[PDB]
């Protein structure tokens, strides 16, 4: 058991060729796709070097966290084009998994780079942009950690805006007839499907005027309250002889009661049905306005722990949307209710615009292409590891269906955070064919063995992605 935690760049290199000398392996801890190896890792080198007020750039080491990168470029009247799931993740490997926010026109996260530094086991440290080398910059942008490490990474800034957050319920039919109008005229906007109920939650966010600027929030949360109150009455007759046989329940979230509801009984369809509903009654007494910084907006703070499987396919152009975008969630609130899945909210969906890394999932030559990135969800209560294990399998199930009925209807592709290897060989064979039919495997693997001939930066997960 190796374990590396270098400071500097040079202390990495230094661990690289050291290894490579011995022909050892190296396990990078988060800068990419998810033993004996010697872990290396890089929380360490996580300071700012550049901050271009002109152009608007940063230059950062690749360990450096989300909410201090922000922080760093805060007082430079800077801030990041767009944030993805958790703040807490280094930059070098949301960048090399595709990582994305939502926006029609802000496209994904490997889009903001526009250089780094790859510390490659044989050719040493490389400096890669669309001038120096484009060919392995756009493939090592997305790169999934397997051509080296990102040591170094110089991202394209914005300024720093208050942004203003619009939540409103609506209706598929409703959006339908707005969608075009919703996806160009917003910023940012994502829709929130609940299953089993025809409510969707449109949360639109855009920058405030520099010139201009219903229900209670207990009241909105009351009827889940009280649902909590007759499920924890119902389902365990033995509990609650008082509300003190567990800690106060108001001054508890929204997203906590949901988690708390759920875990009476997850796999109940029934039960699930009657907490989807109850969210839908929470968002329609929960529409108006917030008004934050793009960071706090934008980002997402301490949620819990979640299987979420998303996939990312073509939604047209803004000029000429497909519609697939829509019709994608319509059949999949349909095999849901059709197989009785004990579904919970939210089906989050979200859109961006096209990247040049041709590993990315949202990868296309078309610069007006844009994608719709679509998650499904189940919660995982902290507790029995008997529970957690058939809420695993349902989901597993719940993450087939739409894989064998959807996917290659839509030409959806799997975010690669996400991405699970199956382990019958008829499924796994078939997922390296369909990968194969839409990145390019072949010049992946040609760089991987230039690169590192010794295989020393190698996972199981990307050989059996790519052989």
Known sequence: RVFHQPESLAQLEEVVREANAKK??????????????????????DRVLEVDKERRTVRVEAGIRVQQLVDGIKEHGLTLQNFASIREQQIGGIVQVGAHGTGARL?????????????????????????????????ARCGLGGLGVVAEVTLQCVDRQELVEHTTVSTIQEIKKNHKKFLSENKHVKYLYIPYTD???????????KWKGKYTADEALQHVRQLYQESLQKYRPDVKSSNEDEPDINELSFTELRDKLLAL?????????????????????????????????????????????????PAGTLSKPSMKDI???????????KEHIPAPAPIEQRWTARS???????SSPAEDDIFSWVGIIMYLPTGDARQRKEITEEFFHYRRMTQEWLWDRYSAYEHWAKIEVPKDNEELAALQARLRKRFPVDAYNTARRELDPNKILSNNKLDKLFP
């Open 199 to 209: 409510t969707v939650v449109v949360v639109t966010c855009n920058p405030v005027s």
């Open 327 to 337: 019709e994608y969630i319509e059949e999949l609130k349909q095999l849901i209710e």
């Open 107 to 139: 496209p994904p996260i490997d889009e903001q780079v526009i250089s780094m530094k790859l510390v490659t086991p044989a050719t040493g440290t490389i400096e890669v942009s669309k001038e120096k080398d484009p060919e392995l910059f756009y493939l």
């Open 24 to 45: 050892a392996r190296i396990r990078p801890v988060g800068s990419g796709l998810s033993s004996r190896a010697g872990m290396v890792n890089l929380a360490l080198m």
């Open 265 to 313: 009984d997850p796999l109940n369809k029934d039960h699930v049905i009657k907490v989807n509903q109850a969210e839908a009654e929470f968002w329609k007494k929960s529409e108006g306005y917030r008004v934050g910084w793009s960071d706090e907006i934008l980002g997402f703070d301490c949620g819990g722990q979640q299987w979420v499987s998303e996939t990312c396919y």
């Open 356 to 362: 040049k890394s041709p590993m990315s999932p949202a």
